[PDB]
Amino acid sequence: DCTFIRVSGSELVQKFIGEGARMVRELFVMAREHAPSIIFMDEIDSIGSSRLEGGSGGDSEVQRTMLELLNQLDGFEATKNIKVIMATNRIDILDSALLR
Amino acid sequence: GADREVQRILLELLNQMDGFDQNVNVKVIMATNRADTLDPALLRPGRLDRKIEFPLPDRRQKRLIFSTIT
Amino acid sequence: LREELQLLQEQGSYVGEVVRAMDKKKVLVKVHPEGKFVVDVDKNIDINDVTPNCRVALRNDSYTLHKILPNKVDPLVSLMMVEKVPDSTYEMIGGLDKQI
Amino acid sequence: GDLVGVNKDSYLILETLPTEYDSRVKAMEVDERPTEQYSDIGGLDKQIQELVEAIVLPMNHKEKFENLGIQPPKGVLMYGPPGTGKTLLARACAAQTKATFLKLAGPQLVQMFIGDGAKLVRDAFALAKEKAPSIIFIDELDAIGTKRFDSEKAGDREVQRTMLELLNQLDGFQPNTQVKVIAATNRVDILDPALLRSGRLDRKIEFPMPNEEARARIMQIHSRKMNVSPDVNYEELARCTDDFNGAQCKAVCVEAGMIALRRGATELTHEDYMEGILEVQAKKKANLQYYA
Amino acid sequence: EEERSKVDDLRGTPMSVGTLEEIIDDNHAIVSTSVGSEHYVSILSFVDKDLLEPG
Amino acid sequence: TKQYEKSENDLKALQSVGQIVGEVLKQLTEEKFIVKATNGPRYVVGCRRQLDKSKLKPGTRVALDMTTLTIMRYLPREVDPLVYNMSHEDPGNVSYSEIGGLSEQIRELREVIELPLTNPELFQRVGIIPPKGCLLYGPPGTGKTLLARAVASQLDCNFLKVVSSSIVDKYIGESARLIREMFNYARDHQPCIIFMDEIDAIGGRRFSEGTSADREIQRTLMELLNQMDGFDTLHRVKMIMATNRPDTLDPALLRPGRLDRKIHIDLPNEQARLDILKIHAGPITKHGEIDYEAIVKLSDGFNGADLRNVCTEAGMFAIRADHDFVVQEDFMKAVRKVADSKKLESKLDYKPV
Amino acid sequence: APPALWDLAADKQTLQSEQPLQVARCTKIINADSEDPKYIINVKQFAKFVVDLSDQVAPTDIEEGMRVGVDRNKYQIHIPLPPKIDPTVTMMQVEEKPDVTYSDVGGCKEQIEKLREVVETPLLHPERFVNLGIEPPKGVLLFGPPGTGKTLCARAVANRTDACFIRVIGSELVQKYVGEGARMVRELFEMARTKKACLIFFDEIDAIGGARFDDGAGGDNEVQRTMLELINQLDGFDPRGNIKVLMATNRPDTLDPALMRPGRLDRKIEFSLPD
Ligand SMILES: Nc1ncnc2c1ncn2[C@@H]1O[C@H](COP(=O)(O)OP(=O)(O)O)[C@@H](O)[C@H]1O
Ligand SMILES: Nc1ncnc2c1ncn2[C@@H]1O[C@H](COP(=O)(O)OP(=O)(O)O)[C@@H](O)[C@H]1O
Ligand SMILES: Nc1ncnc2c1ncn2[C@@H]1O[C@H](COP(=O)(O)OP(=O)(O)O)[C@@H](O)[C@H]1O
Ligand SMILES: Nc1ncnc2c1ncn2[C@@H]1O[C@H](COP(=O)(O)OP(=O)(O)O)[C@@H](O)[C@H]1O
């Protein structure tokens, strides 16, 4: 029954919370209102988004959306009940090892 | 922001079109020459479950488009 | 009916959202089609009864707050969430006995 | 039309008051004229002797064409890297035009919203034909010069249509005939190349580096404001001037006069002059050595 | 004491939310607030007229 | 004295306030009709006693009272821009013969436009659908804008020019509606003809989408499509299209329908340029010494305006000597030498199809 | 509280002085005057009116397109107000107060003096150019290592003897919404002319002055304005700029203002630098 959250998110779920920022903190504030909570990466499971460059930076912040959250989960703040999920096939799975 | 509101209206029509479920009535039929900017919630399960593309006319269709015009 | 039909024209009526309350007993509320106001108690419902980011009925004469209503934020978020995917459960899924 | 007088609930139109709009969009720059005449500067004469025709012959000499049925030149261009000195010169010709002048430049073609520059040029040639005969000269054409070619996307790609309407007014429309318009850039490098015509830009005059004729005379007319110890070669610079712009020569007499200042000197001398040659340009200090 | 029950009528009944923009150096503060409505305020209380500041 | 009092009695009628414009949307009962103000509030009011709803109908431009808001008077059709796009006039007609080349550009566009108007039977005699539009492009050579401008006053009948600039409309660039607002009278004044220069910058690709001002563009394109994508028959309007290049328009326009035919201009032949100088050499009188092929053989690979203007510039360069009549001597020099400078910027003029 | 007590006292005289001049809204620019009695004024509220004046305003003292005060009932002419734009990004860019004077120099003598004779030496005595002048020169050029950039400006901060000059931060010039800073660089000079010769300094002039171009696709196009737009601001005859200028950069590019500076500016000097 723990609440569920996703990643971006278009287009218009962004400024709908706040105005402008790194924009992940407000999403990190959402989980403070409801815990336990489940956060997810929707989707970036595919081999097509790679492009080997042009999709990297697009994925980099999708990769960072976990990183800065992992840095705002483990790095500092608090406390428990918050989780994140990833999905891929290959490529970025090995690029996950770059992050891992 | 007005258009953001009309794409919130697109969201508001995205919202209140699901009231068609169930029964009476609608046929939601869609067309685009470019699929780039279509949002995931526009192709959302329960919104677009069926995709028609443009099949290119070919020998049958040609001979059909050859016969139908003349 | 006529008295409330007499009351309601010379003023109108609206619905506000409290973004803050004041030590002076005033309250920070927006007139949503327009710029914000800041208005006072409103002696029936006290300050501690309602918290910022809540739906109130903006009064039309003293421009105070008439009544109290619930407000929604996550039901927009969670609907954008629940747009994407449903859930089902264990019984409705299979083959994951290893990974569950 | 515009401006029909009405008050509130009365909703009746008493009079229609002329005209148009708006503020500095109305008048880009309305000035008396340049405060000096081109007769001070020289060495570019023969080519501006060709240019001054384009403004003067519609001002006066159109009667020459009434004989044989010719129409005056509309398109004209002015260019070359500074300087040259068109910035002073392209305005300096407005003192001899005597018609009202309007300054257009790239920053004017910078548009907050869309359609203004179009509507501006629609209004600019309103106020041109309205005040005809008048003078209009534009600048920084290269700012809007290129449309890119392929998307996506340029903002001036919409404002290129202001130029295309400026073309459509000089090509697809007759009324642009009067109030001859001139253009200028720092360089002609890349723009819409189709601009060649009389309606769109026609005269292309390359202004080279000022030569020893002008180079001796330019600062001579720039230093005629100030005193001179009455021996100066003016060939010294003119012989040793290489890549030196006509504006640099204006600054050559400055720092030469600046050490004359801090020398407490009464007048400027060539030994002070010729030092200012290598003082302003070039570069260095670095070192002098292994030759000395 | 009495000032609280005095100027509350001048404040009263409600008061809006403006956006502090610019000042006439005489301390008549020209503001742009929805929609672009100005005013001129030299008022003696609660200011700190300086540091409220443009923007 | 009496006429002044008549203007006073005129003013005795003017204290009555003017009514509010309205569009009857639909109706409910004889006392209730759906109507909206131009600013968006929707109302239901009663009518006056002279009218029948057959004189109103739903979706009708009307007027209402200023207090009771009752339906009183009306007009069916109005708009600002329509007639004010009409008034551009080209000398000729005879400018037809004054464009020089080229026959299959000249003659075919007559068969593409004129004959559809007068004899649609010759289309149904064979059974062929009428072409509803035309397309120019370039600019190898030139004349896409004048040949249009010439045919407008040449072909006569009814024609309305579309100024390509102001459509953006600053705030709220929705003005693609104005094309329907223009098409509505194009369905009223029919037949009528439309020239369009610059369809390319309003031909925005949205290739790789960016910022804002592109979105209003692409949206203004969607109507142009749908207007030709009808649901409607525009055949009595003739859409003529020309611009810098026929490339960026995206394939939606590039198909027939929206782009009916392919017509263009190239560098006019020196044989056809021999004629282009006649219409240049006609209005200019000089001493009688002329060899037309001289300039044609000397000056090569030019355009009609490029030749003419420089040919007139040569006369203007030659009249700099203050002498009146000038033999081709100066012109075999000036037009030669001057266009050489003009052909320096002839660079990079060759554009895709 | 004795401040706060006297603070709520004169609201009586404020409410009595409130009724007059309070309706001076809205700040409104005029359009044209055909003859003596008539005027037409235009506002950003969307209200556009052809309307008369209050008798306290003389016709010849007023300018076209001038923000004015008005009583929107009569739509009178109350008083014209000079200022127009710009918001606090100016007041951020515009700076005041002194600090970091000469003596912080790290020993550079005539490297700073060659540029000390250009700026404060003419500013010490603008009369110095009465007799001899001719002119105080147009502009300068500065670049090198960090040491010491913008501290020579800080040196000019403390040693400024007249009015507080205006720093310029680079990445605020480049902006979205094409032409944002285009207004600024244009309009801020009149805001600098409002300070009557008070000097200006630009930082990161290499970044914002970007040169030159690539075929496609800009990108730099909207910024290709700002450079030549500043060159238009350079090509404006007046003053220019009565503030002279002082410019510090890093690399020789951008070339266009660096090849425009021989077309206008002067005094190319250099760091200092180690010795
Ligand atoms: N002989 C001269 N007299 C005065 N100014 C000159 C002279 N030669 C060059 N200049 C200067 O050169 C500058 C720019 O030259 P130019 O390239 O013609 O301008 P732009 O390219 O901006 O039209 C002008 O501001 C002008 O002051
Ligand atoms: N014989 C001619 N005389 C005058 N103008 C001509 C002639 N032939 C072509 N033109 C010009 O060519 C224009 C259309 O070409 P366009 O593509 O707009 O010019 P460009 O090729 O310079 O972009 C017409 O408006 C017309 O003015
Ligand atoms: N039977 C047909 N099959 C395929 N295309 C056709 C047929 N009839 C007309 N067309 C073309 O389709 C175009 C209009 O199609 P439409 O679907 O409205 O355009 P879009 O797909 O861009 O919305 C016309 O230009 C016409 O050339
Ligand atoms: N001659 C000098 N006098 C004083 N400080 C110096 C000198 N030379 C170098 N510095 C030091 O070098 C640093 C310059 O850094 P910075 O301000 O980043 O330069 P820039 O603004 O050019 O990037 C300052 O901290 C300054 O203290």
DSSP states of F241-265 as a string?
EE-S-SSTTHHHHHSTTTS------
Please state, in angstroms and rounded to a whole number, the distance separating the CA atoms of residues F200 and F244: 7
Mutate: best of F168, F276, F279, F344, partner D, most D CBs <10 A: F168
F77 is in an annotated binding site: no
For residue A39, the cross-strand partners are A5
In this structure, the residue with its CA closest to atom 22 of ligand 3 is F252
G88 is in an annotated binding site: no
CB-based contact F156:F124 (threshold 8 Å)? no
Please state, in angstroms and rounded to a whole number, the distance separating the CA atoms of residues D251 and D270: 15
Give the residue carrying structure tokens 């009183």: F72
Chain B residues touching residue A12 (CB < 8 angstroms):
4, 7-8, 11
| 8 Å CB contact of C84 and B40 | yes
CB-based contact G116:G108 (threshold 8 Å)? no
Report the length, in residues, of chain E.
55
Residue G75 Rama label (left phi>0; alpha psi -120 to 50; beta)? left
Stated in angstroms to one decimal place, the resolution of this structure is 6.8
In degrees, rounded to 5, the angle at the alpha carbon of residue G98 between the alpha carbons of residues G94 and G104 is 125
Instruction: Please confirm whether the linkage preceding F118 is cis (ω < 30° from 0).
Output: no
What is the token pair recorded at D196? Answer: 């060649």
CB-based contact G139:G267 (threshold 8 Å)? yes
Chain G residues touching residue E30 (CB < 8 angstroms):
27, 81
Pairing state of beta strands F42-45 and F32-36?
A: antiparallel
b/e map A37-60, b = 16+ CB within 10 Å: bebbbbbbeeeebbeeeebeeebe
Please state, in angstroms and rounded to a whole number, the distance separating the CA atoms of residues F40 and F63: 15
> How many whole angstroms from its chain centre is CA C57?
9
CB-based contact F244:D195 (threshold 8 Å)? no
In degrees, rounded to 5, the angle at the alpha carbon of residue C30 between the alpha carbons of residues C25 and C31 is 120
Please state, in angstroms and rounded to a whole number, the distance separating the CA atoms of residues D192 and D262: 52
Give the CA dihedral A44, A46, A47, A49, nearest 10 degrees: -40
Nearest CA-CA distance, residue D158 and chain F, Å: 6
Residue of A nearest to B9 (CA): A12
* Centre of ligand 1 from the C-alpha of residue D80, in Å: 10
Helix, strand, or coil here: D19?
A: coil
Instruction: Give, in order, the Cα–Cα distances in Å from G32 to each of F118, G36, G210.
Output: 52, 11, 40
CB-based contact G201:G153 (threshold 8 Å)? yes
- Phi, then psi, of G127 in degrees rounded to 5: -70, -20
Question: Of the candidates F146, F204, F348, which has its C-beta nearest D193's C-beta?
Answer: F348
Quickly count: other Cβ atoms within 10 Å of residue G221's Cβ.
21
G147 is in an annotated binding site: yes
Task: Report the pocket of ligand 3 as residue ranges, CB < 6 Å.
Answer: F 225, 229, 252, 255-258
Helix, strand, or coil here: F71?
A: strand
| 8 Å CB contact of E34 and C34 | yes
- HEC string of E1-55 equals CHHHHHHHHHHCCCEECCCCCEEECCCEEECCECCCECCCCCCCCCCCCCCCCCC
Nearest CA-CA distance, residue E40 and chain G, Å: 7
Mutate: best of G5, G6, G11, G13, partner E, most E CBs <10 A: G11
Helix, strand, or coil here: F194?
A: strand
Kindly tell me the burial class for residue F264, based on how many C-beta atoms sit within 10 Å of its own C-beta (0-12, 13-18, 19 or more). middle
Quickly count: other Cβ atoms within 10 Å of residue F173's Cβ.
19
| Ligand 2 pocket check for F142: Cβ under 6 Å | yes
What is the token pair recorded at D208? Answer: 């080279």
Nearest to F95 by CA among F276, F291, F270: F276
Residue F111 Rama label (left phi>0; alpha psi -120 to 50; beta)? alpha
Q: In angstroms, how far is the first alpha carbon of chain C from the final one?
A: 63
Nearest to F132 by CA among F191, F198, F214: F191
F229 CA: nearest ligand 3 atom:
18
CB-based contact D201:D46 (threshold 8 Å)? no
Chain C residues touching residue A34 (CB < 8 angstroms):
74
For residue D134, the cross-strand partners are D100
State whether residue F146 sits within 8 Å of chain D by CB. yes
Instruction: Give, in order, the Cα–Cα distances in Å from F17 to each of F6, F7, F65.
Output: 20, 18, 9
Q: Return the best residue to mutate from G99, G105, G141, G148 for the ligand 4 pocket (most ligand atoms within 8 A of CB).
A: G148
Instruction: Give, in order, the Cα–Cα distances in Å from F61 to each of C38, D116, F24, F32, F47.
Output: 43, 31, 6, 16, 14
Kindly tell me the burial class for residue F31, based on how many C-beta atoms sit within 10 Å of its own C-beta (0-12, 13-18, 19 or more). exposed
Nearest to D151 by CA among D163, D160, D139: D160
User: What is the DSSP track for G190-247?
Assistant: HHHHTTSS--BEESSHHHHT-----SS--SHHHHHHHHHHHHHHHH--S---SS--EE
State whether residue A13 sits within 8 Å of chain C by CB. yes
Instruction: Please confirm whether the linkage preceding F140 is cis (ω < 30° from 0).
Output: no
Which amino acid would we find at residue F184? N
Residue A96 is classified by DSSP as H
Helix, strand, or coil here: G167?
A: coil
Which chains have 3 or more CB–CB distances shorter than 8 Å to chain D? F, G
| Ligand 4 pocket check for G106: Cβ under 6 Å | yes
User: What is the DSSP track for F269-281?
Assistant: PHHHHHHHHHHHH
Please state, in angstroms and rounded to a whole number, the distance separating the CA atoms of residues D78 and D184: 5
Quickly count: other Cβ atoms within 10 Å of residue G260's Cβ.
27
Instruction: Please confirm whether the linkage preceding F139 is cis (ω < 30° from 0).
Output: yes
| 8 Å CB contact of B37 and F252 | no
| Ligand 1 pocket check for D34: Cβ under 6 Å | no
Q: In angstroms, how far is the first alpha carbon of chain F from the final one?
A: 72
What is the token pair recorded at C53? Answer: 């980011």
What is the token pair recorded at C60? Answer: 């039309």
Which residues neighbour G176 within 8 Å (Cβ) at sequence distance 6 or greater? F211
D197 CA: nearest ligand 2 atom:
22
Mutate: best of B4, B5, B11, B39, partner C, most C CBs <10 A: B11
CB-based contact G125:G222 (threshold 8 Å)? no
Q: Return the best residue to mutate from B29, B30, B33, B58 for the ligand 3 pocket (most ligand atoms within 8 A of CB).
A: B33
Please state, in angstroms and rounded to a whole number, the distance separating the CA atoms of residues D247 and F65: 71
Sheet containing F237-242: which strands, arranged edge to edge? F133-135, F237-242, F192-197, F160-162
